Amino acid sequence: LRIPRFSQGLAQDPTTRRIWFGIATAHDFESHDDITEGRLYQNIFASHFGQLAIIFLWTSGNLFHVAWQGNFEAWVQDPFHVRPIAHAIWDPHFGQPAVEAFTRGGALGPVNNAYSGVYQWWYTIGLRTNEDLYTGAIFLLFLSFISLLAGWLHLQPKWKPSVSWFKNAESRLNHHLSGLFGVSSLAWAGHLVHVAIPGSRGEYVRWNNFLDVLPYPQGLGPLLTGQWNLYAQNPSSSNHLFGTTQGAGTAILTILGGFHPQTQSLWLTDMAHHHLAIAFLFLIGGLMYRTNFGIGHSIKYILEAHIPPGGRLGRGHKGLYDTINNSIHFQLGLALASLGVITSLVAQHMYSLPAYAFIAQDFTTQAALYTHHQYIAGFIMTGAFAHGPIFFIRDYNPEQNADNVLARMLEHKEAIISHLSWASLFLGFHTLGLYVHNDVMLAFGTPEKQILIEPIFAQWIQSAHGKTSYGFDVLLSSTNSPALNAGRSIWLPGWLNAINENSNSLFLTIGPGDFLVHHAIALGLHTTTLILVKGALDARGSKLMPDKKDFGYSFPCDGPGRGGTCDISAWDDFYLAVFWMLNTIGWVTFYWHWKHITLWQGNVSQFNESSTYLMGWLRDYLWLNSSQLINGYTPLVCNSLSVWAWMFLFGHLVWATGFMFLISWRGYWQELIETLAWAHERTPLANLIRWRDKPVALSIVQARLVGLVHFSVGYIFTYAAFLIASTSGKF
Amino acid sequence: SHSVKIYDTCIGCTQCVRACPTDVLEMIPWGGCKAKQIASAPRTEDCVGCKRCESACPTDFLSVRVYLWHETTRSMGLAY
Amino acid sequence: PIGPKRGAKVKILRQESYWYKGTGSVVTVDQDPNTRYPVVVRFNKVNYANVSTNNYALDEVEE
Amino acid sequence: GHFSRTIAKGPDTTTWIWNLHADAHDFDSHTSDLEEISRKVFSAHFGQLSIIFLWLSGMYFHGARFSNYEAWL
Amino acid sequence: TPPELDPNTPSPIFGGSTGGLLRKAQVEEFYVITWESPKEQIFEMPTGGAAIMREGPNLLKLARKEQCLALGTRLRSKYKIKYQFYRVFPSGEVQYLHPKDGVYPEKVNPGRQGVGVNFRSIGKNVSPIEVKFTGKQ
Amino acid sequence: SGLTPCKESKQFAKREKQSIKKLESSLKIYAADSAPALAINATIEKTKRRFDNYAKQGLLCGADGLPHLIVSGDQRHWGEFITPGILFLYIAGWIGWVGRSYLIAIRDEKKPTQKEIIIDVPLASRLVFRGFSWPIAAYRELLNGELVAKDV
Amino acid sequence: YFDLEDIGNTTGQWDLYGSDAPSPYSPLQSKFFETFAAPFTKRGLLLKFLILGGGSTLAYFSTTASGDILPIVKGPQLPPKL
Amino acid sequence: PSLFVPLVGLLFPAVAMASLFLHVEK
Ligand code: CLA
Ligand code: CLA
Ligand code: CLA
Ligand code: CLA
Ligand code: CLA
Ligand code: CLA
Ligand SMILES: CC1=C(/C=C/C(C)=C/C=C/C(C)=C\C=C\C=C(C)\C=C\C=C(C)\C=C\C2=C(C)CCCC2(C)C)C(C)(C)CCC1
Ligand SMILES: CC1=C(C/C=C(\C)CCC[C@H](C)CCC[C@H](C)CCCC(C)C)C(=O)c2ccccc2C1=O
Ligand code: SF4
Ligand code: SF4
């Protein structure tokens, strides 16, 4: 009859509630009318092609604007002293001083300074001209199309796959490991040795000459013969100019380690070697499980056989195979969990080990990328912990999982939750305690009475890596051991050079200030996990509500009876954790940024002393770096940072607006609207017009969402405005 | 509209009915308990879903359960 | 006259009861076969609704 | 709840403690006797006046012994 | 039981308010309530204040059904008064609800029909299941 | 431990002098023989004393010129954490054991909650000192330090 | 006092408030307007005409001398590190 | 060129919001 068509019960709502909820439930296929397992699987599979189409289109546009409105070529010729251009600006509201200030990077008009690091990435892989960027944009536009073509193709009956096909896991793993991971990594190693590395050295190897240009002097033979060391005889000289055939070796596969001294980035030869190396593990690994040829494993049976006799895990993992394969919420929560972990692994390894040329010197880009991925990694983790409860409520079969490791979690759930409470309470009581204590004496003017615990455990790890600072005498920095000498030159000499670099971010110096914050982050992790698992383990029910299983993942509440039951659903527990997640990542990004902007200014001394007490954070970090930001537009002038000053205030406004939906609740607003409904009816010249949807206050759950969205958007945008401007201003 | 159910664990104290302001429930002759009565939910159409009935139930966990389902003007409690 | 004494302590087996694995004293036990749940039980601790008693099914252990 | 007998009764949950203070001055919920209430609040005003009076005494006292008022003059 | 029916009766004294019926009554539904008073008393009247009860049949038209019961439940208390209300609709029609059976819902009656009674007991409900229904059937 | 002990520190030593000069700056406006005078001078000796003591007991002091505690377990610096830590757990357990011992004694007979809001039972018969030997609760553990109602 | 199941309208606020006026008309000048306002009375056809009337906005911006789209000229700042 | 497109990026909301409105009230 009406929108939403997928929900008839929703479509018959006379109020404005239907339009809202029609949007918020469009992707929840399992709740749609007359849903079948068949319809469920190839809706996702088709929605999957839709997502790919967006990514390729989004990436196509990036290659387009940089080629059309970005200099790039000007950037290539002097990567150190030119600012990359994202795209042009066209805004009628712009005053002349605006068009003025934003004209940068040698552009004919006002543009935006790119902080995505696409310039360094594209330059490192071998893109040298705008023409190259266009061909990529066209190719991605074409890739974006065939994704839609495949999406449309499998929605057709003559090409649609069976659910069982989707549930054949043994073969999907075998291909994804061997093909999706292995081959793609192998193919990339080819681009590196054919284009990236030779493009780095100085030769332009492209489609019209790649067929006639050897990647290596010696033939393809040495690989096939067996002697592969010949691919490492002649590496690039330390004093090598990128994009210049100066001090350029011939080797296409090395393990030098450390950084290319001019670019401060990892060697391309190391990477061409890396991907080639990992491709194999993936390639062999993608041949573990059984398919149609008579050899291979059975995942189920391996899970079945893993039962420790004599307790204490019970039935082990029996029936666990079918619980996962029949539940795509388990799979997603399992996927987000793994993806979320390596998302941070990207953030941690990309600032410590820069992969692209001239990215380490672009301090605004480095800060942005780390902060970017940590918040991305943050939200992903809350999703892995969100599809968890949904699995328990919608897809969990208690009987089929009788006394296995999964079912043993629900029967001692009070143990996991209470100790998470203890660990959270422990960390909080002392981390906050040590902080406040330190502020007291500095107020009292006696900073020599502070509790400054030296992170001696972590410093012991640093010395174990090769850092000759401190007197620890541990592996890779000791007097006699099998570890360092296993270096056998190769990685160690180039890498040990890199670790004792006082300039790079590769293993910075840490102290008492680094101790307190790491505990704050540990507090943030534990508490967030406490909230999320408690929502998961009590998703099917508690003692306050034993039949929570019968109400679904998201419901408003259970009423004011039995003392009150506000925010008792597993959905709300997620919604509460999102707050704690933002706080945690907030502390992480604060800690990363401040320690770096003090390092970049050549003044780590200020961080080492001000980070030990909380007033230092608010003043020497928050207050101190805001001056240039908040003067983006002044009652006297107008700078290029005016965008960020405005967005800074914008973020504050969205943030505070969420507070309205989180503090004030529905019954007040509904009664207010009822008076407004009366008004409109009794007002002449306005009676002629009537609404087609009954005006009602937002729902209890909707408001918690809407408020959280405001809270999260303002949270991000405010810090984004500050992270960029404060860093861009000083550089 | 809203979905309400009654369970045999009831003891016929009739408090769920007295609590309801829209008259959704009523008492029914039954042989299951000493009162020999039991709650009934005939008029779910007039149910607003406020769970006043649940806060009057003395049974260890509720014998009457309200499951908020599809919304209607009556359930939305609108006077306009 | 049926399963549980008048003063006997009894462990609850409902799973949905506030006192799910707890113990409690029985008030009495009606003898009408019609009655689904007799075996009234007193408890020392109240639940989220401030009631101290509840009637249970015949299936429970004693102690 | 000291004020009311059933209220005082016994404690079974911690909610009793919070309620005790929340309705400590809620005199019209302890009795329906208007005279009893009025008598209660009238005396309560005296107890108030005593506290602010004591408050004033400390302000004058501190001004005498622990202040540099003479020096400021 | 035979519904008594209501034809015409005088309305209680009041003088007007802004909480009365509005459009919904014209196009969807409106509810009327009738009660007899042994004295011209004064009652609160929801959605407003102070109205004289009147003595006689007493007929009042309201909306939401609930407004009628609130008044009715206050009408049964304070004053020992019997009452009944119906749902008028927009095109005549006679739907009589409450008491209905003629004896109050709280008082057990001989022939009512259970409607939505589960003899399973709570906690013995199942878990889905992609099939229709939720398990609390 | 890139830190060099508070004795051979030039920063931590400099920090001492900086603090006392500021205090000395204040007594110049009050004229000795006056009250605010001693209070300032009494503060100065405490300043000198605490700086003097910290150098004695060890304490490594970073480049910032402030003492950093070492909690690795190093025997040279046990007094910085382990010995105070052992003292804490002692009192922490003692409190824990005395409190537990109380709620246990209360439970049989009486109205148990009556004793919780009002304890006109002081240390019961004599429960406090029982904490002097709390660690013997290890022997309570081998018997029934825990109830067997839920799990093991 | 006055409820009549017969007429459900007066019972409700069905009645047009006296602001209704079903009186005569206005001068014959209408004969003119009815002639020239006809093409816009069709609906849907007008919906389109106005949207394609958005072709005006394109025309007005493609050609516009006095909107800030020029620096006007300056020598740009380097500026924090060039 | 680039002064023709951001407005059709604003004609489009006018068109989209209108169409969607018709879709949701149907
Ligand atoms: C692989 C990634 C992935 C996939 C495929 C899914 C898929 C699903 N999720 Mg999940 N989720 C994920 C990740 C994912 N999620 C992550 C990472 C989190 C952590 C936050 C969550 C948290 C989450 C919750 C809490 C819920 C789901 C739910 C669902 C289901 C229905 C969602 C829906 O249609 O509602 C519609 C979605 C919208 C209408 C989104 C619009 C609102 C957001 C705020 C817009 C983005 C913010 C804002 C607009 C930005 C504008 C700012 C501007 C100023 C620039 C569906 C199976 C729901 C469910 O399972 O039903 C029971 C459910 O309640 N997810
Ligand atoms: C009220 C004042 C105002 C207004 C109206 C604008 C308007 C605009 N600005 Mg300006 N800006 C302002 C103040 C303002 N700005 C101030 C004070 C500063 C600091 C001095 C700037 C600095 C600035 C810069 C640097 C740039 C702009 C740009 C733009 C243009 C955006 C391009 C676009 O439309 O693409 C599309 C529009 C969007 C993508 C917005 C989508 C976000 C929505 C809310 C979320 C998604 C909605 C969702 C899909 C729901 C669907 C519903 C929908 C289909 C109806 C637009 C003309 C950019 C530009 O010139 O374009 C080339 C540009 O780069 N502005
Ligand atoms: C060689 C055989 C092969 C290959 C190449 C693929 C490939 C793919 N499948 Mg298919 N599949 C296969 C066989 C294969 N499958 C078989 C035999 C079956 C069952 C009989 C299936 C059933 C199946 C289903 C049901 C689905 C897929 C899907 C997908 C897509 C996954 C989504 C994605 O693009 O991210 C790919 C990820 C990578 C390429 C990298 C791996 C992730 C790492 C961790 C990222 C980090 C890499 C690096 C460090 C970072 C570089 C960043 C830098 C470049 C900027 C992908 C295109 C999904 C889909 O439809 O697409 C949206 C999906 O729904 N497959
Ligand atoms: C449970 C609380 C807790 C948590 C979650 C962490 C977590 C962390 N610590 Mg901290 N640590 C703790 C307690 C904790 N620590 C305590 C009580 C001390 C002594 C003051 C330390 C001293 C310490 C140092 C020196 C360092 C860390 C570091 C770290 C990080 C790396 C992992 C590690 O080595 O720690 C190991 C944690 C343990 C070995 C203790 C586990 C928790 C026990 C069970 C708490 C109770 C022990 C009890 C008090 C012992 C009695 C002492 C004595 C009387 C016998 C990680 C964030 C490193 C870092 O990255 O610095 C920035 C680092 O170098 N920790
Ligand atoms: C900063 C966040 C914030 C904002 C903006 C508001 C705003 C408002 N509150 Mg609220 N409130 C808040 C936080 C906030 N509150 C919090 C944290 C609480 C907890 C106590 C409350 C509790 C509360 C109560 C109890 C009430 C309000 C009410 C109101 C409204 C008063 C009427 C009004 O001024 O309208 C004007 C709107 C503004 C001034 C907001 C800014 C308008 C912008 C600048 C103009 C429009 C921009 C543009 C055209 C949008 C188009 C862009 C396009 C792309 C969409 C107003 C909407 C009252 C109300 O309902 O109205 C009487 C009311 O009763 N608030
Ligand atoms: C003319 C002065 C006056 C008087 C005589 C009363 C009297 C009364 N009020 Mg009222 N009230 C007043 C002003 C007054 N009020 C003002 C100005 C407000 C607006 C804020 C209120 C808001 C209010 C509410 C919401 C309620 C009352 C209620 C009551 C009744 C009993 C509640 C009670 O016992 O208190 C109980 C005392 C406490 C619970 C102590 C709470 C702790 C306080 C608030 C912390 C204060 C912080 C402190 C100042 C600074 C920090 C110190 C700390 C760090 C150590 C009683 C008749 C209650 C009632 O139901 O009426 C019958 C009721 O719920 N009042
Ligand atoms: C040595 C040391 C260290 C380490 C530590 C550690 C690492 C450890 C541990 C630990 C652990 C891992 C432990 C565990 C456990 C467990 C359990 C299982 C428990 C229990 C308990 C109980 C049962 C108690 C009870 C009680 C008492 C007895 C008292 C009072 C309270 C109550 C009453 C509560 C560091 C180096 C840090 C520092 C230096 C020293
Ligand atoms: C203000 C407020 C309302 C009233 C809010 C209403 C009526 C929402 C209506 C918002 C109007 C329509 C303007 C919003 C415009 C948005 C930008 C929507 C954009 C359109 C799409 C992106 C969805 C509640 O209903 C409520 C309920 C529960 C707790 C707190 C609150 C609460 O704080
Ligand atoms: S939720 Fe409200 S309307 Fe529904 S049965 Fe309970 S008391 Fe009646
Ligand atoms: S409250 Fe429970 S026991 Fe009492 S009448 Fe209602 S359903 Fe029966």
Domain coverage including residue F100 = 1-152
Any idea what DSSP says for residue F82? H
Question: What is the number of domains present in chain G?
Answer: 1
Would you say A268 and A274 are in contact if contact means Cβ atoms under 8 Å apart?
A: no
> Cα(B77)–Cα(A15) distance, rounded to whole angstroms?
11
CA of A295 to the centre of ligand 6 (A): 78
- Three-state SS string over A561-610 comes to HHHCCCCCCHHHHHHHHHHHHHHHHHHHHHHHHHHHHHHHCCCHHHHHHH
Residue A305: CB atoms within 10 A of its CB come to 11
> Cα(E10)–Cα(A544) distance, rounded to whole angstroms?
51
Sequence ranges of the binding site of B? 10, 13, 16, 20, 47, 50, 53, 57
CA of A697 to the centre of ligand 5 (A): 15
Is A294's Cβ below 8 Å from some Cβ in F? Answer: no
Question: For G58, which residue in chain H has the nearest alpha carbon?
Answer: H4
Crossing angle, helix A37-68 and helix A328-352, to 10 degrees?
Answer: 20
Which amino acid, one-letter code, is at A330? Answer: F
Helix (H) or strand (E) holding F50: helix F35-56
Is the CB of A90 less than 8 angstroms away from the CB of H23? no
Any idea what DSSP says for residue A453? B
Query: How far apart, in Å, are the Cα atoms of A139 and each of A60, A134, A637, B6, G38?
Result: 8, 8, 45, 63, 52
Choose among A264, A251, A265, A258: nearest CA to A494.
A258
Residue C26: CB atoms within 10 A of its CB come to 21
Any idea what DSSP says for residue A237? P
> Cα(A364)–Cα(A660) distance, rounded to whole angstroms?
34
> Cα(A269)–Cα(A543) distance, rounded to whole angstroms?
61
How is A276-341 classified by DSSP, letter by letter?
HHHHHHHHHHTTSB--SSS-SB-HHHHHHH---SSSSSTTTTTTHHHHHHT-HHHHHHHHHHHHHH
Question: What is the number of domains present in chain C?
Answer: 1
Query: How far apart, in Å, are the Cα atoms of A18 and each of A15, A25, B1?
Result: 6, 10, 14
Ligand 7 atom with least separation from CA of F137: 28
Encoded tokens for D38 = 């009025």
Residue B33: CB atoms within 10 A of its CB come to 22
Judged by DSSP in three states, A136 sits in: helix
Encoded tokens for A593 = 């940024």
Q: How far off is chain A from B31, nearest CA to CA, in Å?
A: 26
Interstrand relation of B3-7 and E117-118 (parallel, antiparallel or unpaired) = parallel
CA dihedral of residues C4, C5, C6, C10 (deg, nearest 10): -60
How is A390-434 classified by DSSP, letter by letter?
HIIIII--TTTTTTSTTTTTSTTHHHHHHHHHHHHHHHHHHHHHH
Judged by DSSP in three states, C11 sits in: strand
Residue B25: CB atoms within 10 A of its CB come to 27
> Cα(G64)–Cα(F104) distance, rounded to whole angstroms?
88
Is the CB of G74 less than 8 angstroms away from the CB of A729? no
> Cα(A515)–Cα(A264) distance, rounded to whole angstroms?
28
End-to-end CA gap in chain C: 18
Helix (H) or strand (E) holding B16: helix B15-19
Encoded tokens for A151 = 């999406």
Is the CB of E116 less than 8 angstroms away from the CB of B6? yes
Choose among A334, A341, A335, A352: nearest CA to A376.
A341
Encoded tokens for A550 = 């019968």
**Residue F127, domain CATH:** 1.10.8.110
User: Cα F102 to the chain's mean position, in Å?
Assistant: 26
Residue keyed to tokens 């968890």: A388
Encoded tokens for E31 = 């509810």
Q: What are phi and psi of A189, to 5 degrees?
A: -60, -25
User: Cα A431 to the chain's mean position, in Å?
Assistant: 27
Q: How crowded is the C-beta side of A140, counted as CA atoms within 13 Å?
A: 18
* A32: alpha, beta or left? (left if phi > 0; alpha if psi -120 to 50): beta
Would you say A347 and A374 are in contact if contact means Cβ atoms under 8 Å apart?
A: yes
CA of D41 to the centre of ligand 6 (A): 14
Choose among A155, A24, A123: nearest CA to A705.
A24
Is G21's Cβ below 8 Å from some Cβ in H? Answer: no
CA of D6 to the centre of ligand 10 (A): 26
Query: How far apart, in Å, are the Cα atoms of C26 and each of A348, C53, C54, E61, F149?
Result: 62, 9, 10, 53, 20
Encoded tokens for A80 = 């150190």
**Residue C9, domain CATH:** 2.30.30.50
Choose among A573, A540, A570, A583: nearest CA to A715.
A583
Domain E1-137, what fold? Answer: Photosystem 1 Reaction Centre Subunit Ii; Chain: D; (3.30.1470)
Q: Where are the beta strands (DSSP E) in A38-108?
A: 85-88
Query: How far apart, in Å, are the Cα atoms of A122 and each of A48, A106, A132, A236, C31?
Result: 27, 20, 10, 21, 85
* A552: alpha, beta or left? (left if phi > 0; alpha if psi -120 to 50): left
> Cα(A157)–Cα(A38) distance, rounded to whole angstroms?
12
Would you say F73 and F82 are in contact if contact means Cβ atoms under 8 Å apart?
A: yes
Is the CB of E125 less than 8 angstroms away from the CB of A550? yes
Could you give the angle at the alpha carbon of E68 between the alpha carbons of E62 and E72, nearest 5°?
Answer: 145
Whether chains F and B touch (3+ CB pairs under 8 A) is answered by: no
Domain ranges of chain E: 1-137
**Chain A residues touching residue E122 (CB < 8 angstroms):** 547
> Cα(A47)–Cα(D45) distance, rounded to whole angstroms?
71
> Cα(A181)–Cα(A595) distance, rounded to whole angstroms?
36
**Chain C residues touching residue A563 (CB < 8 angstroms):** 48-49
Residues β-bridged to residue A297? A289
Encoded tokens for A688 = 């002629």
Would you say B51 and A559 are in contact if contact means Cβ atoms under 8 Å apart?
A: yes
CA dihedral of residues A418, A423, A425, A429 (deg, nearest 10): 160
Choose among B53, B33, B34: nearest CA to B43.
B53
Ligand 7 atom with least separation from CA of F95: 30
Judged by DSSP in three states, F1 sits in: coil
Query: How far apart, in Å, are the Cα atoms of A285 and each of A291, A625, B31, C12, H26?
Result: 14, 50, 67, 52, 55
Is A411's Cβ below 8 Å from some Cβ in E? Answer: no
Which residues fall within 8 angstroms of residue A125, CB to CB, at 6 or more apart? A191, A192, A195, A196
Which residues fall within 8 angstroms of residue D50, CB to CB, at 6 or more apart? none
> Cα(A535)–Cα(A366) distance, rounded to whole angstroms?
36
Judged by DSSP in three states, E70 sits in: helix
**Residue B66, domain CATH:** 3.30.70.20
> Cα(E70)–Cα(B22) distance, rounded to whole angstroms?
9
Residues β-bridged to residue E43? E51
Residues β-bridged to residue E118? B7
What structural domains does chain A harbor? 1-731 (1.20.1130.10)
Which residues fall within 8 angstroms of residue A199, CB to CB, at 6 or more apart? A126, A128, A205, A243
Choose among A240, A251, A237: nearest CA to A198.
A251
Residue G68: CB atoms within 10 A of its CB come to 17
Ligand 7 in reach of F94 Cβ (< 6 A): no
Query: Whose atoms come closest to the Cα of A43: which ligand?
Result: 3
Residues β-bridged to residue C62? C10
Any idea what DSSP says for residue A15? B
Encoded tokens for B7 = 């369970």
Is the CB of A561 less than 8 angstroms away from the CB of C47? no
Residues β-bridged to residue E54? E41
Any idea what DSSP says for residue A106? T
Residue A152: CB atoms within 10 A of its CB come to 12
Whether chains H and G touch (3+ CB pairs under 8 A) is answered by: yes
Burial status of residue E14 (CB atoms within 10 A of its CB: 0-12, 13-18, 19 or more): middle
Query: How far apart, in Å, are the Cα atoms of C6 and each of C26, C27, C29, C39?
Result: 6, 6, 7, 9
Query: How far apart, in Å, are the Cα atoms of A34 and each of B70, F54, G75?
Result: 16, 76, 66
Could you give the angle at the alpha carbon of B46 between the alpha carbons of B43 and B47, nearest 5°?
Answer: 90
Domain coverage including residue C22 = 1-63
How is A169-212 classified by DSSP, letter by letter?
-HHHHHHIIIIIIIIHHHHHHHHIIIIIHHHHHT----TTTTTS
Sequence ranges of the binding site of B for [4Fe-4S] cluster? 10, 13, 16, 20, 47, 50, 53, 57
Encoded tokens for G28 = 């014959």
Domain coverage including residue G45 = 1-82
Ligand 9 in reach of B49 Cβ (< 6 A): yes
CA dihedral of residues E56, E61, E67, E71 (deg, nearest 10): -10
* Resolution value (Å, 1 decimal): 3.0
Q: How crowded is the C-beta side of C23, counted as CA atoms within 13 Å?
A: 9
Encoded tokens for E65 = 């059904």
Q: How far off is chain H from G2, nearest CA to CA, in Å?
A: 38
Choose among A566, A586, A619, A448: nearest CA to A517.
A586
Any idea what DSSP says for residue E45? -
Q: How far off is chain E from G44, nearest CA to CA, in Å?
A: 29
Burial status of residue G29 (CB atoms within 10 A of its CB: 0-12, 13-18, 19 or more): exposed
Q: Where are the beta strands (DSSP E) in chain E?
A: 31-35, 37-43, 51-56, 59-62, 83-87, 95-97, 117-118
Crossing angle, helix A700-730 and helix A570-600, to 10 degrees?
Answer: 10
Which residues fall within 8 angstroms of residue A589, CB to CB, at 6 or more apart? A370, A371, A374, A375, A719, A723
> Given CA atoms H14, H20, H23, H26 in this order, what sign does their dihedral have?
negative
Judged by DSSP in three states, B7 sits in: strand
Which residues fall within 8 angstroms of residue F43, CB to CB, at 6 or more apart? F23
Which residues fall within 8 angstroms of residue A274, CB to CB, at 6 or more apart? none
Question: What is the number of domains present in chain B?
Answer: 1
> Cα(E51)–Cα(A84) distance, rounded to whole angstroms?
77
Could you give the angle at the alpha carbon of G5 between the alpha carbons of G3 and G7, nearest 5°?
Answer: 90
Choose among A254, A249, A268, A250: nearest CA to A489.
A254
Which residues fall within 8 angstroms of residue E76, CB to CB, at 6 or more apart? E82, E83
